[PDB]
Write a protein that binds this ligand. Structure first.
Ligand code: CLA
Ligand code: CLA
Ligand code: CLA
Ligand code: CLA
Ligand code: CLA
Ligand code: CLA
Ligand code: CLA
Ligand code: CLA
Ligand SMILES: CC1=C(/C=C/C(C)=C/C=C/C(C)=C/C=C/C=C(C)/C=C/C=C(C)/C=C/C2=C(C)CCCC2(C)C)C(C)(C)CCC1
Ligand SMILES: CC1=C(C/C=C(\C)CCC[C@H](C)CCC[C@H](C)CCCC(C)C)C(=O)c2ccccc2C1=O
Ligand code: SF4
Ligand code: SF4
Lengths: 39, 137, 81, 150, 728, 31, 39
């Protein structure tokens, strides 16, 4: 490769998969919140 | 017990869990003037008008303020102190003499005494296998 | 808490009652000397062990003493916590 | 603007009353409602036994020997055991002032009771063992990524 | 007019009456200067301070002129002139009687005496001093100026004393001092340098007949020899009239490094340095507002800087800085202390005098002296800060200010502080003893140096690196790096090192970290006394009662040592530890891998042999490989002509134990023993009328700590003095 | 030529200044 | 070794570790006992 380290090998999956996962999970539980508070 | 407290932002020398579950002390007095002053838990504040509720965890701070601060500087001599139980019971611990005289009354509390010279003093040399001390005559 | 001890040499200047910051003294009526009112300890339970009082007693062999006991508590130990 | 009185020994600094932090602290298994003390113990054991084996896995005196994996496993096993022992005896002597100091706006839960503590310790034991074995499995095949070679 | 001295207690009304007991003596030496404890007036105070300052300056002039005079009539300077290498300077010739006759420090040329180490001749190798008669005149001038300004103090106190508004013009104060004092003195000294210093320095390259070299009068109006060198220095060509300065590239240059023909740096750089500083802080010191209706209203600047976290900013701070004095005292003391220790930490990499790195005796003496003074007085700065807190404050002018905002949340600060101290403390020392055990346990692979478990301070290495290649780009008009410990070539002269790059491996880590550790705990103690000065969580009468008092009775258990200066007691113990191990570290490294001898190949054969990479990792090694070398001669370093000075290191231990005796013991015991001896004396009719009374516990604590410090520092200076004599 | 750990550096300059600055500029408008 | 058996191999840990453990545990629960009985 080049003078950088492994990083481009494994830093895509978490951004590709797990961060979307928590994003949509938090989002869904957000769109059902009680009243009148919400985070 | 008045719904008012001197002007004071805040600090970290406040109360603990021992305070609102074992005891609180309370002191009140009459300050028709509002003057900046100090407090024993660190920091300064400025008093309120008329009734002035200062609530605290110990006793000696109220005594120090009343003696060294209030009447020694600002000449206010009608502060009352109380001991608040964990449930709400209050004890008029002081003034037990009303006017804070510390020497005057027509009759006072009379129980017990010792008016005895010390050269002649009971000793463990004599008082043996007892539970008392030199407090005999 | 601790124990207090009174004697006859109380001249009655009453510098001790103005020195103790713990409200454990009062001048009960006496007759013997010109004092007519001798100091005593009605409220021992708030004793602190500072014994600033006898340092304020001017009498030769100062008239008050404090026998420093062993039954201490949160009050006698004086903790804000 | 203190919690209830500006003269109390507490401050409204934007680190102990920030909305982000309060949401992040409330939903932790120590406080998030709608669960049993059992699950609490299970999850805490899972987490801790899942991370508390590396700190001596390749760090122990057998660091570079060809066995140290199961060595660290046994070590963290004994560790979680004695931790459960400690918490259990604490529960055994627990009930002076049977409370916990409350600063979260609400009380945490009815988790504050002796038998509750015992069940919590049991679940802790189970989850800790589980986290231990699963971490040992992740770490077992050194080639876990070499087969992927990504 | 002499009817007035022998009336003691003239300043106090209480102890003026008579000496009842011995106590009356003690306080006599205790309240002779705090005249703030005499009245409420201030003009008198200020006048006293002025006169005292004048007296201190007078003794300054006296001692410096006398030391000169000794340097003129009893010092082998003018013989050491022609050869500063093969001769070791000396002074204070020994008086030939019984006891001091074998102590003739003969330093070649038959000159006996005492081989001194203070490097004044080094100044006298830069000032270009030929004959001792001019020096005689110099001492005469110093002493007459001393007497002159002393007389001036007498006059300005007894005849015409200044008024009160004369105090608080800090604006004109800063302007006058900053500009007139510093800039004019510095530029005058630079003018002296260029006219005389570098000329004779030139003339000290090959034996150019020093006394035969002309005198300054031969150069005041004689520009011919001044036109020999520096063609632009014909007169000056005076191109400053033409704004052109390119001609002056002769003397006013920028080299920045070691000059291997002087034992120090290139003096031209120092001259241009002084010029630049002079004009720079001249135009600086021209800042503040004064009598021409132009300038900063400085009490409004601090009003402006406030904000959300600030509260109300720096409002209301000048009443503190002018109405009270102890404040200024404390802050200036702290700043001076810090400045002094950086000076110490500074002038062993950039020697600013001739023959400094080549002279391996004066260096660490100067270093350690200044370093000790630094701490020894910054603690006093903190003490005066505390004394301000107890003496001067205000509940009114201190509402919510950046000052008050900490005294309200002190507990969090100090708790987190304690946290940090604990962390660093064991994180370092327990790690150390862990490695100790491992080495003693046949498990050497568990050591922590390069040959074992790793840790490397990359930050220092990278900063030193980015310092190495500085010139050219960051410093285009610059020739060599600023020093040679960061990077460059190993600069030297003879078989004797001047400066080589210093290596930071593994052992540096824990050393610097325990430095930080002790500094943290020191701050902890001092700041703790600072905040908890007026009111504690148990004692709400501290400021209501004083700051110098022993205890408050056996209430709450015990309460002894609850004042503040006992806090500074503990603090001074700790700073003793700090500076002691600091000087240990410095001396050992700069004798282990910086200093030694040299071969024709530049081969630096250091004194010890790089012992840190070998033993400065375990405790038992630290005693072995340091004090074995630091004493193995002092045992036998006596017993001949230039050895007879049996040093009082053998003697200091006694004062140390006698010290610790005072600490562990109470006083009532001594009082009763005193009463028994009094009984006996009274039986034999010799009873002293003035009844002796034992020391007060604070007095005893003070004398104990004093003797402790004295013994320790005497011991250590004896150590490394003899150690350098074994090599210098 | 090309670079080194200095790229971990330029990564480090992010996630404090731009990261939480943008975080605040987002959460200002009351989700 | 010698003519004795394994015993000096493993009989220190229980005396070293577990017996102190029960000792201090029993001790602590003893120093909190109710009234007026205690074992
Ligand atoms: C700064 C303070 C200071 C100190 C600590 C000393 C200390 C000393 N001086 Mg000295 N001196 C000083 C200032 C000082 N001097 C000044 C300002 C002058 C110029 C007036 C002299 C002129 C001087 C002379 C001329 C001599 C000393 C000598 C001495 C030594 C013996 C003192 C003696 O017997 O009296 C002096 C005794 C006689 C003059 C006889 C002693 C080390 C004597 C010595 O041992 O030679 C160095 C000596 O002969 N001093
Ligand atoms: C106990 C007896 C004794 C006496 C009376 C002296 C007397 C003297 N010593 Mg001395 N000395 C002694 C023991 C003694 N020494 C011992 C045991 C040692 C160690 C071996 C020394 C080491 C010593 C040194 C190293 C020096 C003296 C010096 C001096 C002279 C000036 C110091 C002085 O008297 O005080 C001060 C008085 C005035 C300043 C006046 C003076 C003649 C100094 C000298 O000869 O030059 C001045 C000097 O440099 N002494
Ligand atoms: C009689 C005792 C005595 C006296 C009066 C002096 C006096 C002096 N010594 Mg000295 N010295 C002594 C004993 C003494 N020394 C001994 C026993 C040794 C060890 C062998 C030294 C080693 C020594 C060195 C190495 C140096 C001095 C220096 C000095 C001068 C600096 C002044 C000073 O320190 O002011 C404070 C007064 C006192 C400490 C007293 C001063 C004239 C310094 C000097 O000449 O500077 C130019 C210097 O460099 N002395
Ligand atoms: C440019 C003019 C000028 C200069 C050069 C000085 C110089 C000095 N002033 Mg000064 N002063 C000035 C103007 C000036 N003043 C004005 C205009 C005022 C009125 C506000 C004052 C008010 C003033 C006070 C109130 C004091 C000084 C003091 C001092 C001395 C400080 C000690 C020192 O520098 O150690 C030099 C040391 C060596 C050379 C050795 C120093 C000699 C202090 C003092 O008493 O002197 C000791 C002091 O307390 N100054
Ligand atoms: C040619 C040189 C020169 C010049 C033109 C000035 C000019 C000035 N100075 Mg100044 N100053 C100088 C040298 C000079 N300075 C030096 C060398 C010192 C140190 C001794 C000072 C110390 C000084 C102080 C302490 C103060 C000034 C102030 C002033 C201003 C008042 C105007 C006035 O009457 O001054 C005319 C001056 C000359 C004709 C000369 C003015 C801008 C005052 C001012 O405005 O401060 C805000 C003020 O308080 N100066
Ligand atoms: C230029 C420096 C300087 C100055 C002017 C003072 C001045 C003073 N100090 Mg001081 N001090 C200093 C440095 C200084 N100190 C340093 C460096 C330390 C730390 C080692 C101290 C530690 C210190 C303590 C611990 C005390 C003083 C006290 C005092 C005051 C009474 C001193 C006295 O009459 O002594 C008479 C006594 C002797 C000469 C012995 C006086 C205002 C005392 C005080 O609070 O008085 C107000 C006091 O208790 N100082
Ligand atoms: C054997 C010598 C020795 C040792 C090991 C300690 C150890 C300690 N002292 Mg200490 N101390 C000592 C001698 C010693 N002291 C002496 C002689 C004095 C009087 C001069 C003091 C005065 C002193 C003060 C005034 C303070 C300490 C503090 C501390 C603690 C620092 C925290 C830490 O790193 O833990 C070390 C842990 C291991 C070594 C394991 C620690 C317990 C400070 C503290 O409480 O810090 C939290 C503190 O405030 N000590
Ligand atoms: C205070 C600093 C300090 C540090 C950082 C270490 C660090 C370490 N020690 Mg150690 N040790 C220390 C102090 C310290 N020790 C002291 C004061 C002693 C008493 C003499 C010991 C006695 C000791 C022994 C007997 C052994 C270690 C071992 C170890 C290693 C195993 C790590 C481990 O189990 O952590 C666990 C951390 C957590 C669970 C969190 C590790 C490198 C072991 C090792 O690897 O041999 C060197 C080992 O056998 N240490
Ligand atoms: C550190 C130290 C030291 C030292 C010190 C010093 C070194 C100082 C310096 C000082 C200086 C170095 C000073 C100087 C000064 C100067 C000045 C200040 C000047 C001024 C000037 C002027 C003022 C001018 C005038 C004029 C003239 C002359 C002419 C005409 C014009 C006019 C008028 C302008 C000692 C050892 C002691 C001690 C220890 C420490
Ligand atoms: C010894 C001692 C005494 C006794 C010391 C007294 C009573 C001082 C008496 C005055 C001294 C003895 C005069 C000093 C005499 C000169 C020092 C001259 C003698 C020569 C010597 C230098 C050899 C105390 O009173 C005391 C009090 C509190 C804590 C510790 C101690 C303590 O350690
Ligand atoms: S004990 Fe002292 S203060 Fe009290 S009455 Fe007697 S003399 Fe007065
Ligand atoms: S210590 Fe002395 S002053 Fe304090 S309560 Fe007891 S008797 Fe009174």
């Amino acid at each position: 490769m080049f003078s950088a380290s492994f990083l481009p090998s494994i830093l895509v999956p978490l951004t590709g998969l797990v961060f979307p996962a928590i994003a949509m999970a938090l989002l869904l539980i957000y769109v059902e919140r009680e009243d009148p508070s919400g985070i | 017990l008045s719904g008012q407290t001197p002007i004071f932002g805040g600090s970290t020398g406040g109360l603990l869990t021992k305070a609102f579950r074992e005891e609180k002390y309370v002191i009140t007095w009459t300050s028709p003037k509002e003057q900046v002053f100090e407090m024993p838990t660190g920091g300064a504040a400025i008093m309120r008008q008329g009734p002035n509720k200062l609530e605290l965890a110990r006793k000696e701070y109220c005594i120090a303020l009343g003696g060294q601060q209030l009447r020694a500087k600002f000449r206010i001599t009608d502060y009352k102190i109380y001991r608040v139980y964990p449930n709400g019971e209050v004890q008029y611990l002081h003034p037990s003499d009303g006017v804070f005289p510390e020497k005057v009354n027509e009759g006072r509390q009379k129980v017990g005494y010792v008016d005895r010279n010390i050269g002649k003093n009971p000793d463990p040399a004599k008082l043996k296998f007892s539970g008392m001390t030199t407090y005999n005559a | 808490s601790h124990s207090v001890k009174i004697y006859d040499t109380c001249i009655g200047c009453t510098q001790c009652v103005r020195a103790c910051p713990t409200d454990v003294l009062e001048m009960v009526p006496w007759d013997g000397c010109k004092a007519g009112q001798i100091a005593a300890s009605p409220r021992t339970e708030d004793c602190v062990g500072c014994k600033r009082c006898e340092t304020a007693c001017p009498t030769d062999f100062l008239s008050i003493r404090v026998y420093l006991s062993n039954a201490e508590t949160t009050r006698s130990m004086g903790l804000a916590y | 603007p203190s919690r209830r009185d500006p003269q109390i020994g507490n401050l409204e600094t934007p680190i102990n009353n920030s909305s982000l932090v309060k949401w992040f602290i409330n939903n932790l298994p120590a406080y998030r409602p709608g669960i049993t003390p059992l699950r609490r113990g299970l999850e805490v054991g899972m987490a801790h036994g899942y991370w508390l084996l590396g700190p001596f896995a390749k760090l122990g005196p057998l660091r570079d020997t060809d066995v140290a994996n199961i060595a660290g496993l046994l070590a963290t096993l004994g560790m979680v055991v004695i931790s459960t022992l400690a918490v259990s005896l604490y529960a055994a002597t627990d009930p002076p002032k049977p409370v916990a100091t409350v600063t979260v706006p609400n009380p945490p839960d009815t988790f504050d009771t002796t038998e509750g503590w015992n069940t919590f310790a049991s679940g802790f034991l189970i989850g800790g063992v589980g986290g231990a074995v699963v971490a040992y499995f992740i770490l077992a095949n050194i080639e876990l990524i070499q087969n992927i070679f990504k | 007019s002499f009817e007035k001295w022998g009336q003691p207690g003239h300043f106090d009304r209480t102890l003026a009456k008579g000496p009842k007991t011995t106590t009356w003596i003690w306080n006599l030496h205790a309240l002779a200067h705090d005249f703030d404890t005499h009245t409420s007036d201030l003009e008198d105070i200020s006048r006293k301070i002025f006169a005292a300052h004048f007296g201190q300056l007078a003794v300054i002039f006296l001692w410096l002129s006398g030391m000169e005079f000794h340097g003129a009539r009893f010092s082998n300077y003018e013989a050491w002139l022609s050869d500063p290498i093969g001769i070791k300077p000396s002074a204070q010739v020994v008086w030939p009687i019984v006891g001091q006759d074998i102590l003739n420090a003969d330093v070649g040329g038959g000159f006996h005496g005492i081989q001194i180490t203070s490097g004044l001749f080094q100044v006298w190798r830069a000032a270009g001093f030929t004959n001792s008669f001019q020096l005689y005149v110099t001492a005469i001038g110093g002493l007459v100026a001393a007497a002159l300004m002393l007389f001036a103090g007498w006059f300005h106190y007894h005849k015409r004393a200044p008024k009160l508004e004369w105090f608080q013009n800090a604006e004109s104060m800063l302007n006058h001092h900053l500009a007139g004092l510093l800039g004019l003195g510095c530029l005058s000294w630079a003018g002296h340098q260029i006219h005389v210093a570098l000329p004779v320095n030139k003339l000290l390259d090959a034996g150019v007949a020093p006394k035969d070299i002309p005198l300054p009068h031969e150069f005041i109006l004689n520009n011919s020899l001044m036109a020999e060198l520096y063609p632009s220095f014909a007169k000056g060509l005076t191109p400053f009239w033409t704004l052109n300065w390119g001609q002056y590239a002769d003397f006013l240059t920028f080299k920045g490094g070691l000059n291997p023909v002087t034992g120090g740096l290139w003096l031209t750089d120092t001259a241009h340095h002084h010029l630049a500083l002079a004009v720079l802080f001249i135009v600086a010191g021209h800042m503040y507002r004064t009598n021409w209706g132009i300038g900063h209203s400085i009490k409004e600047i601090l009003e402006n800087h406030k904000g959300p976290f600030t509260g109300d900013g720096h409002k209301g701070l000048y009443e503190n800085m002018t109405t009270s004095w102890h404040a200024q005292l404390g802050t200036n003391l702290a700043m001076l202390g810090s400045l002094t220790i950086i000076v110490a930490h500074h002038m062993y990499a950039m020697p600013p005098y001739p023959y400094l790195a080549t002279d391996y005796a004066t260096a660490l003496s100067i270093f350690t002296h200044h370093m000790w003074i630094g701490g020894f007085l910054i603690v006093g700065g903190a003490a005066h800060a505390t004394i301000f807190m107890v003496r001067d404050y205000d509940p009114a002018v201190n509402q919510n200010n950046v000052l008050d905002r900490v005294i309200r949340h002190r507990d969090a600060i100090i708790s987190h502080l304690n946290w940090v101290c604990m962390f660093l403390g064991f994180h370092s020392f327990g790690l150390y003893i862990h490695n100790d055990t491992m080495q003693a346990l046949g498990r050497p692979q568990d050591m922590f140096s390069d040959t074992a478990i790793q840790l490397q301070p990359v930050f220092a290495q990278f900063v030193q690196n980015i310092h190495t290649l500085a010139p050219g780009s960051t410093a285009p008009n610059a020739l060599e790096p600023v020093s040679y410990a960061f990077g460059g070539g190993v600069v030297a002269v003879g078989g004797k090192i001047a400066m080589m790059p210093i290596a930071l491996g593994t052992a540096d880590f824990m050393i610097h970290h325990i430095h930080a550790f002790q500094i943290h705990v020191t701050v902890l103690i001092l700041l703790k006394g600072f905040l908890f000065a007026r009111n504690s969580r148990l004692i709400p009468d501290k400021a209501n009662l004083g700051f110098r008092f022993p205890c408050d009775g056996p209430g709450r258990g015990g309460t002894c040592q609850v004042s503040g200066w006992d806090h500074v007691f503990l603090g001074l113990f700790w700073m003793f530890n700090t500076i002691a191990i600091a000087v240990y570290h410095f001396s050992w490294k700069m004798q282990s891998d910086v200093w030694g001898t040299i071969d024709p190949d530049g081969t630096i054969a250091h004194i010890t042999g790089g012992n840190f990479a070998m033993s400065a990792n375990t405790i038992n090694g630290w005693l072995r490989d340091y004090q074995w070398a630091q004493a193995a001669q002092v045992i036998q370093s006596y017993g001949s002509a230039l050895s007879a000075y049996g040093l009082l290191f053998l003697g200091a231990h006694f004062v140390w134990a006698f010290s610790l005796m005072f600490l562990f013991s109470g006083r009532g015991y001594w009082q009763e023993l005193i009463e028994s001896i009094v009984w006996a004396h009274n039986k034999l009719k010799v009873a002293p009328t003035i009844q002796p009374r034992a020391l007060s516990i604070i007095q005893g604590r003070a004398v104990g700590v004093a003797h402790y410090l004295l013994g320790a520092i005497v011991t250590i200076w004896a150590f490394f003095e003899a150690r350098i004599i074994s090599v210098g | 030529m090309s670079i080194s750990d200095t790229q971990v550096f330029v990564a480090l300059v992010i996630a404090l200044i731009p990261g939480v600055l943008a975080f605040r500029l987002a959460t200002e408008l009351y989700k």
